[PDB]
Structure 1
Amino acid sequence: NKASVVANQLIPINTALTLIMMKAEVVTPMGIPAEEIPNLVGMQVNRAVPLGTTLMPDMVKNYEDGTTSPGLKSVVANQLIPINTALTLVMMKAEEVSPKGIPSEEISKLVGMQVNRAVYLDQTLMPDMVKNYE
């Protein structure tokens, strides 16, 4: 019904979108609308986006706070962290997002733990990536 956020140009992998790249056109499929334009802008995609691609929640990891109640809030790396780096709650954001990798129940004991793999922008933390997880 309303205008959806569809990228006008083609975007590469892991790239923050801009105002010129984000176009509010009324087209399908209806992915994410332009309500959280300031929150969705500069989001990093998981793969290459073609031209005229609508905002899809399955292609973007943590695009914005679309979920209302937390409950199943999993830890997510809001910023990019290099391999083997003691990251703490500052860069870790445990919010309700999919998929549900590792919850924030033992984060207090792993605060400032060194990861064994490379971490990208807003990505969900998983037990398969961390080899020193409890």
Structure 2
Amino acid sequence: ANQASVVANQLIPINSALTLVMMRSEVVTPVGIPAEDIPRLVSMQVNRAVPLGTTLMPDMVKGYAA
């Protein structure tokens, strides 16, 4: 409905630090990390490969807590 999540704009390899080109905002279901937090995600690492178009979930980001 109106809440957007962070979605991978490219494949993100396992253990890569997130950069802004990697993250778009889209209204997807199920809901993942709120698109509002994209600034705060830069430089944090993902703990698994995230294919293009996959919603980024809290458990995929090392050290994420919000």
Task: Work out whether the TM-score is over 0.5.
Answer: yes
| Structure (1 or 2) with the larger CA radius of gyration | 1
Equivalent residue, structure 2, for 1:14: 15
**Which digits, 9 at most, give the CA deviation of each residue in 1:9-52, with x for residues without a partner?**
10101111121110011112211112222111222111111111
**Which digits, 9 at most, give the CA deviation of each residue in 1:42-72, with x for residues without a partner?**
2211111111111111222312x41xxxxxx
Q: Which has the higher helix share?
A: 2
Q: Give the RMSD, CA atoms, in angstroms.
A: 1.4
Q: Which has the higher strand share?
A: 1
Equivalent residue, structure 1, for 2:3: 2
Larger RCO (CA under 8 A, 6+ residues apart): 2
Identity %: 82
Native 8 Å contact 1:3 1:24 kept in 2 = yes
For 1:14, give the aligned amino acid.
Answer: N
Equivalent residue, structure 2, for 1:30: 31
For 2:15, give the aligned amino acid.
Answer: N
Q: Which runs of 5+ in 1 are unaligned?
A: 67-134
| TM-score, normalisation: structure 1 | 0.44
SS at match of 1:28: coil
For 1:61, give the aligned amino acid.
Answer: K
SS at match of 2:40: helix
Task: Give the aligned length.
Answer: 65
